[PDB]
Write an enzyme that holds these catalytic residues in place. Structure first.
Site, PDB file in Angstrom:
ATOM      1  N   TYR A   1      42.627  31.668  49.142  1.00  0.00           N
ATOM      2  CA  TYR A   1      43.367  32.107  50.334  1.00  0.00           C
ATOM      3  C   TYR A   1      43.324  31.124  51.493  1.00  0.00           C
ATOM      4  CZ  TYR A   1      44.464  36.833  48.705  1.00  0.00           C
ATOM      5  OH  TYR A   1      45.003  37.862  47.971  1.00  0.00           O
TER       6      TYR A   1
ATOM      7  N   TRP B   1      46.383  35.316  43.064  1.00  0.00           N
ATOM      8  CA  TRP B   1      45.281  36.271  43.006  1.00  0.00           C
ATOM      9  C   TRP B   1      45.715  37.623  42.454  1.00  0.00           C
ATOM     10  CZ3 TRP B   1      44.730  41.000  45.672  1.00  0.00           C
ATOM     11  CH2 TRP B   1      43.479  41.632  45.478  1.00  0.00           C
TER      12      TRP B   1
HETATM   13 CL   LIG Z   1      44.365  45.671  47.888  1.00  0.00          CL
END
Ligand SMILES: [Cl-]
Ligand SMILES: [Cl-]
Lengths: 295, 296, 294, 295
Positions: free
Chosen positions: A55, A286
């Site tokens: 991220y 992800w």
């Molecule tokens: Cl979530």
């Protein structure tokens, strides 16, 4: 299989992923009170630090571990609030807030308490200014974890307007700023509200796309809403939503190009909008792989 | 410039397009009082019969001219109504309904009057019963291009639902059956509910996508604006998302057609009907992308 | 007729209202330069301090005047804005913010500037902590007056959720805490979000009900419900009023619950009651103010 | 506990109720194949004829029994449909439509079939043109009794627009016209569209108000929709919807006054809209007492 549509964005992982990962994972296996061995290696398999690195691929080399530590403990706490009532979960978190501010001393005999305390102490010691700025975004998130939201009629527009203000995505954007050492002024932030809102919807919808199967174990998701509004199956809806997500990525590029053409793009904002782009590609990767959306 | 996504629907054109086009255009150029040559050429260039043949490629050779005439007058009327008030408008039309029924004879001094009368009288001569079945749909459609729009908020869901019942699409589907000599039972059409709703929605949205720029000459009331606002993107981005949605409705159509034959079953009639709708959807798309009716 | 339905909420009025009115009215009548002797007498007629004293009946005696002055100026700026572009307006307001902070000095040549400066310098002088705590709520509100509404379909449910977060209502509830000298931690604030959301709605809807007519020249619960139910505006106001009485009953229930779950505190008990006064006061005000061309 | 707010309308029952009831009841007791003596008592207990006389108090003396028989058989079929799939139910009714038109003969050994055939045959024998006019309204209703609803986010506005076109209410208004001998031209009917729509919402909402508790036995009701859009309890929503209903009563009177002010209110129209007023007050009393909404 969905088959994501073409994109100009691409996931990227932080350079020190392997290093920070082992460091932070070790710390928690050392201090956190896991119930048993199954939980111990379920934790390693989760790889929260690798998530964090996906991220915030551009975080500064000496601050990425902070992010991993904060997200790891919040993931852990999140999973814990699952087994407790509203009153207890809320009480649990409200107690960690004064400790997080450093205003109240840990009970050195309770892991989560001294982990949280030490974490924030070390963050302020590294950068008090920026460390204090991210406190509220965190508290907001923490309070929302035990929030009881109302089920109500909601079309696509209402649902998306609601996701634009998601505190989870807000915490991510603020944590990214801390990780990148990006001290953005009040004026600069205001300049990218549209970009933030646009990004916030992207992350949310991609999550909805890949979490629907599990959600269909208070169902509030863009997949169901669009399916019902357009009278098509959930899968067709995921396909339409994915194209909408690409429209949002193109919008992002446009909002950024505009910002710069008007000469309102500072070096800080440039790093920032780019950071957001990786948050979008990262979240997508992800979502496609996280075990949390399995079943 | 807006690349439509891939489609398994292939539009067709009725073989007699050139034949009827000449017959029907010739008739109107002779009876309708076109203001001038500039209007005469535009009318021809608009080829309303070619539109009909695109929507009804499976129409019976000896009925396709009826559809062309019907639709041509409705397009000519529709054109005049925008130069009037909802009251005048409704008056102009309401006057033509009794004449369509035959109960009221033409004032051969007013072309539109005797063109409406003669056409309807001619449709009964061929197949009285079926020519009677599409009367309601035709009036319901005329008793709508005059009706006032009851404001009220509207999201995508509500807008799509409302389009599933568009009376213009119903007239098209009813005109299609008469044209293909299809005679379905009250129960038969009941079995294709979802198919008709899904198709009317496809047709409406594709129209929205291509008529947006023109409509934006002004309030709107179109899926293009509604999605753009709900998703917070540009109208062009919205057109592209809505187009993908149209392909989903095409996939849904096929699935609904499959279940129909599998589950219990269709009928020679419903199989022809159902295929007919597919041709409308693809014909409508080719038409929407090429018609000057949406040109600014 | 529009006969308000019965309510168990009884509005209160601050006893010092007359004292503060002439005190505050006189202040602006000296520094605020109106167009004519009429716009002037029109000002003293509106009585913005009376409005303030209806909203914050329990403001502390030595602070009620701060509230009166702040609202009196927001209301004045308000009317002033109604005559300038979304550019001239946002400029105007944006220069009153740093000055409100005390970071930028008031060009003493422009009244609104030094009125704002002195007012805020004055509030910090009285209670610096609580005074800095209202800067944000005031700024959020001032920014809101200058932006044009969104642009998306909105039914009753969305419009009411949008109002549960009204900037103005948040400003009023923050002004109220400053006025009552209530220091509430974000933790206690958390425990009454339902109550605040509920109150916020009540205030906005009662406002929509009485301002509908003037707004003749939109975004309002009155028009939305009229279209959704397919009845007249007047009939909508009447249905909305009954809904407000339901929100009042809801307030009472939320308050009893907050008290039942051992979550109530003396400061919260006060804040919660204070919101009640705002609801009933706002209603009394809405039914009588000339601002809505009674 | 729920107190209806003041109203200027009042319920009224048809003068011949006792007579028609005996007759129509007797007919079905004679012909309908009630499983056991138990269901026969329950049947007479339901008093479907008495309900009919509450909705059509202005019905002509010689036609009220036609309405009672039609509604009785519809209520009876409605209950049977409860033990069938949508598909089975649909086939069941689709069989009875050609018989209703008189196009196909009854199977004299299947009660519903000949009871339906004989009823319509006798209605056409009493008033051919008007009987044929109610065919469509009945068939629409019969078919609607078995199709799927399709869940979709819906606000108060969309839900009310839906009820405005309710086939049930359309059936009652048409049946009321047949019962009162009101032959209304195609133009007279269009002048009453707003009034018809207004009335539909009223009957449906009033039904929602009293049927809510019964519906909570596990959906799509104004009570549910309003409670969550306003964020109050179902009971409060009921109280608010009831006032709205009264606003629709006023609107009905206003629409009638205007229709009259302008030059378009024939005698047939006048008896029609008065007929709708008693349908509204009647539906309210029925909604308040019917066992169909109990436990
Ligand atoms: Cl979530
Ligand atoms: Cl069109």
């Amino acid at each position: 299989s969905l088959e994501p549509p073409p994109s100009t964005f691409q996931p990227l992982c932080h350079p020190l992923v392997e290093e920070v990962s082992k460091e932070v994972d070790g710390y928690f296996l050392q201090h956190w009170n896991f119930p048993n061995e199954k939980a111990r290696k379920k934790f390693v398999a989760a790889g929260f630090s690798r998530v964090t690195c996906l991220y915030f691929p551009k975080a500064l080399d000496d601050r990425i571990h902070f992010a991993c530590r904060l997200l790891t403990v919040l993931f852990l706490i999140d999973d814990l609030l699952e087994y407790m009532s509203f009153e207890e979960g809320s009480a649990y978190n409200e107690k960690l807030i004064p400790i997080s501010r450093g205003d109240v001393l840990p009970d050195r005999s309770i892991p989560v308490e001294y982990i949280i305390y030490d974490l924030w102490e070390s963050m302020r010691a590294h950068d008090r200014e920026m460390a204090d700025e991210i406190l509220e975004p965190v508290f907001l998130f923490m309070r929302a974890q035990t929030d009881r939201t109302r089920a109500r009629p909601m079309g696509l527009g209402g649902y998306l307007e609601y996701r634009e203000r998601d505190v989870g995505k807000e915490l991510l954007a603020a944590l990214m700023r801390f990780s990148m050492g990006l001290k953005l002024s009040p004026s600069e932030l205001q300049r990218v509200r549209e970009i933030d809102a646009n990004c916030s919807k992207h992350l949310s919808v991609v999550n909805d796309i890949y979490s629907y199967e599990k959600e269909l174990y208070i169902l509030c998701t863009s997949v169901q809403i669009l399916a019902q509004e357009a009278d098509v199956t959930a899968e067709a809806a995921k396909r339409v939503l994915f194209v909408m997500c690409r429209e949002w990525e193109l919008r992002h590029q446009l909002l950024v190009a505009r910002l710069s053409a008007e000469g309102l793009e500072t070096p800080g904002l440039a790093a920032y909008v780019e950071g957001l782009e990786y948050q979008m590609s990262g979240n997508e990767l992800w979502s496609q792989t996280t075990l949390r959306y399995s079943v």
